Design a protein around this nucleic acid. Sequence first.
DNA 1: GTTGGGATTG
DNA 2: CATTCAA
DNA 3: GAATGCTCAATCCCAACTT
Length: 546
Amino acid sequence: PALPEPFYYLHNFRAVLAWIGERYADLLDDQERAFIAAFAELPEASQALLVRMVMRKGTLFREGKLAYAEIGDTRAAVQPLLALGWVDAQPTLELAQLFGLLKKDELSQLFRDHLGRANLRKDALLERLQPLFPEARRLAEWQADFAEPVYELRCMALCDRLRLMYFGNLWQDWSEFVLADLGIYRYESVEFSADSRGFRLRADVDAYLHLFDCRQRFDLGEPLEELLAGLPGEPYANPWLEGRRVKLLFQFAQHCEKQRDFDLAQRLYRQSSHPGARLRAIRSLERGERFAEAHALAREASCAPESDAERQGLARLLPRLQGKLGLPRQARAAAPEIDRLDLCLAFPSEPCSVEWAVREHLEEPGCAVHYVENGLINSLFGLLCWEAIFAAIPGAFFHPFHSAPADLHSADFRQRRAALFEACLGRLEDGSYRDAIRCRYRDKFGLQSPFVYWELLGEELLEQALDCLPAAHLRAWFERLLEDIPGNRAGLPDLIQFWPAQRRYRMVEVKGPGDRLQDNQLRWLQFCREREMPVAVCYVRWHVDD
DNA sequence: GTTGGGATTG
DNA sequence: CATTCAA
DNA sequence: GAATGCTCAATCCCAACTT
């Protein structure tokens, strides 16, 4: 869609280098400063060519796929990069990499004397020929008549280290700059300290890179024996880093449980503080026929549960373990009688998921039904509390592209922000919360945020929600979300219906045939019907006339 | 000729 | 989380 | 009662599939 400067991407890259120079100046090593300075020495076209290679996929390129008009002649622009070693000409290629660079026609002809196989695909061709050609070669040693040179980028690790230093993570690309400049991504602007940055110590960057590496190798099928040997056993000082580690241990354990190695899964879950891990360790011990440990851990956990999810899970585990130890059957109570509404509806032909069906059936004159499912309540929260969620609390925002503060999932996130929350939530006690939300809605429309789904929240659903929802219910929900954000942001009922005449609402969780209530949904039903909130669960059967 | 997936571009 | 498994 | 399969559209290139 034509940004006016043909070098827009190079401009952005220079912006990141400068930014890292001022904010990270104390964290950079010798190789890094040499890279930034050397890059500043490059002629514009070689700078541009570099950034082009960095932003594309993989490290290997054919000269002809590197044509660009701002740069002109590619060979000329690449020569200064060859002199620094940041690009190899004539690298050494594994057969698979040769297969990445080459067309299937060229490859079919090249090895034609070893192909009697069949007409068959490219990946199969690679498979058949790999036991034949294990030894890597330069491109010239593969075929000497191939007339297009091939370049390999050699600085990608140092670039990824720069990316992660600027963004505080590796998932965000440099195209963040162009997508925000084009208005495809619109981020809220925070004014944060000129000393604000993602990483404090160099070793914390080093560690993020090590965990990231570990996840990569695991995803490639590496045995956990050397994976675990490589991880640190001791927990990290930096807590947000210990989150990454602890998540990784968690997935290792899940993989183990899949392999039915229950003792190791238990071990790995037990050394992780990841939310829900203790539960998975009890359940793993039970699966490993280790009942006494499972029971012990379950009693430990029930003394001081981590979450409501953990309370609910122990409620099933404990009695089954008690039974497995031959302990007396302990009396319990029935579920709090979910308030249910049965519907027998036409068979659609064709589907038409069931939630749309109930939503149609419940919509009459006078009744408005919306398929929202925790997007409306979270949105109302994010609108009211916007000014606290985006507060300039130090270390919460270090660059223009945050969709959420960095500490959003930290334990004292609310404490750090305390006043500003009881300010915002306070507007629920006077009348001002409606106006405040409508203005925040108009001001902030489209801005990326953790809790506000704008696509879902049209002006009409906003107005009906505002005038039909009690403020005290809003406060109840909003405090429940704040208490544990990541465990409570999901599970609200599929539908919500409004009767704007009498300003009334009811939420409806929809369940088709073969559908049952998840755990979080059940906790939200319990929470709602302890407030005498209007929730109902709707179970649907289909009618086929024959 | 003709789709369809993935890399690329702004 | 929406399909499969267990009596 | 429980075990498990990081968001844009428009465009260009290359593999696969028709007769």
